[PDB]
Design a protein around this ligand. Structure first.
Ligand SMILES: *[C@@H]1O[C@H](CO)[C@@H](O)[C@H](O)[C@H]1NC(C)=O
Ligand SMILES: *[C@@H]1O[C@H](CO)[C@@H](O)[C@H](O)[C@H]1NC(C)=O
Ligand SMILES: *[C@@H]1O[C@H](CO)[C@@H](O)[C@H](O)[C@H]1NC(C)=O
Ligand SMILES: *[C@@H]1O[C@H](CO)[C@@H](O)[C@H](O)[C@H]1NC(C)=O
Ligand SMILES: *[C@@H]1O[C@H](CO)[C@@H](O)[C@H](O)[C@H]1NC(C)=O
Ligand SMILES: [Zn+2]
Lengths: 194, 597
């Protein structure tokens, strides 16, 4: 009977990039989702299949918590059946999504005067990603047909650009710290529920 | 594996890089504009060099994709806007020569040192001097001296520079597969590859000439009225049936006739409308002015301003300790950061100017969803039209009575309507022939139909034939009187003002027809008309992703430029001028001159 480490997940100092989103396996603890519901400090809290306030008296085998940072108008890509540079090349969710997404504005922390160019995201890829797969490669993308030998040149460019986060940019370009939960069911016993 | 996929990926990379680079550049420029120091200018110039170098390198990388093998219209538009490098096509020595020529012309125009022959130590600069002299003074000899002295001091020096400039620009344009530099400018209104919405570059000249031929009668009546009133104001220096002297037109060149309002007022005893005192009484400040502008814009259904606008914009003069430029501007810094830089006093003119700038900002916010290379107006003459229609809709007495700045018992009559319409014609109809004649002369000199030993001759006879304005002093072939204007000497296109003047009235007429306005068009208010707001946003949200003809059809229903809305706007003043000038000769003879007695 322990409180799940949501403090070092939400209240954490720095969130990972969207192309290298942090994947933490939480289990063997007691998590009250009602305080997360009533935090009222998030701008997006949406999931289907089970209501969050009704999910409190339910549990499954294991739960996964995905966390990253994206722009403001890129949180809409975190949903099943969506298309975008985040939903395809950076973070894909299956149509049978069982958890939901927690996103909030984070200009006070992730935006600095002069530009916070430390957040990255993958722009190009030879094929779209499958649901729940990570790609942190650093190879050069070949847009043309000739090999460029791992060097950037004509039709060759590093497929990893940086988010330019400024404190003054509009909401459609402000950093939004996104947390994504996942509730999977297996043949094992249920260990994490209130 | 194809070429279009590579072009799309390259455009994606370029957009995502250039957005951050341009954001940094505009941010440094803003830090300079609101805080004038030396390190701020250093940072602004450094960011500008970075942005220009990036643009040149990206044009170099983009010139590797042929347009003839690209099917997508948006990708083709972006590739065409990115491939036009500019002066890098010419040689290096010729490029540096042209740059030095432009810089020299700009410097001679900006630092013109003209002084009277009575005392050489003290004399007046252009801005705080010659402008106020030509705008407020009334002595004939004084205005003539100012005009002739500025001409002989600026154009006489700019003539050979302008000749070499013309030659180098023609060389650069012919190197870019254009016919001349005028064709390069007309390439702004060019549309290709869109069945049913095409527009050639000579079709622009054709439609401009047709629209001006249709405007001719109203301008002739206005010119007759102004000539009569100026003959009343100048008893022995204006012929009753001739042209108007060039220095009696309200400014250095005669671009606008706004400064002849006091001399040409219809009913001088009737008080013109002004809501400054009602603002002073009700404790009106900049914040209240901009809040009322935002409310006017949200009443038509357009979204209100963002929080960053109210948090970052400079709406008041920041005291005395820190100096900043006080020119009103609408700032689109990129990445969803819209701001307005304006030193606003408690004035009705500043109220209308704030409405104009917020219209600019609304138009900027509209097409923010378009790709980076397509975030601009449909053509060069759309932003100022979108601003001017908002200014017109907010300047009407109906809106001033709605927001409580005017008494509900105000008895508006035909006299005030005629006064307002005549002022509007002085500031609107008076600049159309000037603009058309100037752009026609510049196109014909760029083309070669005017040899360099006929420049001033053709310029002055075209002015006499079109604008109906005669010079008071004969000018030989050493003058470069066109270059005496800011736009001619600083390499700026001038037809955007004509096109904007026509487009703003087309927009006003369409928006009012969509608002179910009954009565004259000059008394129209688009406030609380969400249908009109939607009809306007349908075009505002496009940007330049579609041909400007389609964008114009999306509002006015017509694909082409037209002057019928402008004439329908000025019908009341037209009938008034027709009733007034029945006992006076209308028209001008291009032979009479104030120097041949
Ligand atoms: C982390 O900080 C935020 C902001 O102060 C606070 O609302 C939140 O409760 C903190 N985390 C925890 C687990 O209390
Ligand atoms: C303006 O810039 C100077 C240095 O360039 C700085 O000391 C000052 O604080 C700035 N003022 C504002 C209002 O930012
Ligand atoms: C052009 O490409 C965009 C994607 O960049 C696509 O949405 C659009 O439909 C394409 N249009 C044409 C005519 O190919
Ligand atoms: C602008 O509109 C939004 C939309 O509801 C509203 O929340 C906001 O308060 C408005 N801004 C102002 C200054 O009223
Ligand atoms: C617009 O509608 C509002 C709300 O009814 C009203 O207060 C205002 O006076 C109206 N203004 C005009 C110009 O119709
Ligand atoms: Zn403007």
């Amino acid at each position: 009977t322990n409180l799940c480490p949501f403090g070092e997940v939400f209240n954490a100092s720095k969130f990972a990039s969207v192309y290298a989103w942090n994947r933490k396996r939480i289990s063997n603890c007691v998590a009250d989702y009602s305080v997360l519901y009533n935090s009222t400090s998030f701008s997006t809290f949406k999931c289907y299949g089970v209501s969050p306030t009704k999910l409190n008296d339910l549990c499954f085998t294991n739960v996964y918590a995905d966390s990253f940072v994206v722009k403001g108008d890129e949180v809409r890509q975190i949903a099943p059946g969506q298309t975008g540079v985040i939903a395809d090349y950076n973070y894909k969710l299956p149509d049978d999504f069982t958890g939901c997404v927690i996103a909030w504005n984070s200009v006070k922390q992730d935006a600095l005067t002069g530009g916070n160019y430390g957040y990255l995201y993958r722009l190009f890829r030879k094929s779209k990603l499958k649901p729940f797969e990570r790609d942190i490669s650093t190879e050069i993308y070949q847009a043309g047909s000739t090999p460029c030998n791992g060097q950037v040149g004509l039709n060759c460019y590093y497929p990893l650009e940086r988010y330019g986060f400024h404190p003054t940019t509009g909401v459609n370009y402000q950093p939004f710290r996104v947390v994504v939960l996942s509730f999977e069911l297996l043949n094992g016993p249920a260990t994490v529920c209130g | 594996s194809t070429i279009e996929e590579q072009a799309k990926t390259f455009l994606d990379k370029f957009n995502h890089e250039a957005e951050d680079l341009f954001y940094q550049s505009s941010l440094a420029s803003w830090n300079y504009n609101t805080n004038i120091t030396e390190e701020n200018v250093q940072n602004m110039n450094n960011a500008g060099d970075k942005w220009s170098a990036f643009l040149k390198e990206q044009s170099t990388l983009a010139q590797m994709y042929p347009l003839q093998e690209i099917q997508n219209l948006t990708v083709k538009l972006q590739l065409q806007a990115l491939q036009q490098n500019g002066s890098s096509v010419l040689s290096e020595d010729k490029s540096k020569r042209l740059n030095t020529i432009l810089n020299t012309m700009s410097t001679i125009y900006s630092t013109g040192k003209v002084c009277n022959p009575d005392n050489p130590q003290e004399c007046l600069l252009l801005e705080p001097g010659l402008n106020e002299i030509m705008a407020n003074s009334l002595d004939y000899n004084e205005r003539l001296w100012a005009w002739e002295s500025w001409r002989s001091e600026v154009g006489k020096q700019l003539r050979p520079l302008y000749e070499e400039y013309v030659v180098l620009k023609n060389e650069m344009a012919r190197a870019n597969h254009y016919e001349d530099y005028g064709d390069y400018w007309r390439g702004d209104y060019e549309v290709n590859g869109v069945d049913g919405y095409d527009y050639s570059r000579g079709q622009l000249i054709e439609d401009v000439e047709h629209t001006f031929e249709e405007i001719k009668p109203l301008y002739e009546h206005l010119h007759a009225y102004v000539r009569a009133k100026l003959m009343n104001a100048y008893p022995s220096y204006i012929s009753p049936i001739g042209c108007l002297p060039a220095h009696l037109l309200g400014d250095m060149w005669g671009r606008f006739w706004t400064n002849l309002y006091s001399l040409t007022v219809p009913f001088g005893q009737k008080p013109n409308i002004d809501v400054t005192d009602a603002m002073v009484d009700q404790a009106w400040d900049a914040q209240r002015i901009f809040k009322e502008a935002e409310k006017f814009f949200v009443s038509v259904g357009l979204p209100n301003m963002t929080q960053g606008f109210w948090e970052n914009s400079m709406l008041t003069d920041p005291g005395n300790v820190q100096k900043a430029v006080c020119h009103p501007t609408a700032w689109d810094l990129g990445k969803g950061d819209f701001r307005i830089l304006m030193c606003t006093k408690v004035t009705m003119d500043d109220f209308l100017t704030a409405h104009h700038e917020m219209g600019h900002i609304q138009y900027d916010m509209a097409y923010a969803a378009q790709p980076f290379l397509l975030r601009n107006g449909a053509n060069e003459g759309f932003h100022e039209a979108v601003g001017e229609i908002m200014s017109l809709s907010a300047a009407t007495p109906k809106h001033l009575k709605s927001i409580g700045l005017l008494s509900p018992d105000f008895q508006e009559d035909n006299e005030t309507e005629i006064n307002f319409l005549l002022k509007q014609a002085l500031t609107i109809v008076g600049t159309l022939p000037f603009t058309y004649m100037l752009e026609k002369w510049r196109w014909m000199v760029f083309k070669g139909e005017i040899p360099k030993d006929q420049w001033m001759k053709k310029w002055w006879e075209m002015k006499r034939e079109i604008v109906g304005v005669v010079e008071p002093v004969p000018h030989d072939e050493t003058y470069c009187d066109p270059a005496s204007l800011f736009h001619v000497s600083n390499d700026y296109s001038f037809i955007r003002y004509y096109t904007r003047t026509l487009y703003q009235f087309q927009f006003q007429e369409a928006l009012c027809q969509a608002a179910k306005h009954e009565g004259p068009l000059h008394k129209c208010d688009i406030s609380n008309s969400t249908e009109a707001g939607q009809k306007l946003f349908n075009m505002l949200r496009l940007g330049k992703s579609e041909p400007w003809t389609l964008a114009l059809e999306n509002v006015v229903g017509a694909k082409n430029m037209n002057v019928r809305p402008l004439l329908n706007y000025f019908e009341p003043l037209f009938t008034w001028l027709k009733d007034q000038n029945k006992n006076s000769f209308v028209g001008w003879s291009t032979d009479w001159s104030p120097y041949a007695d």
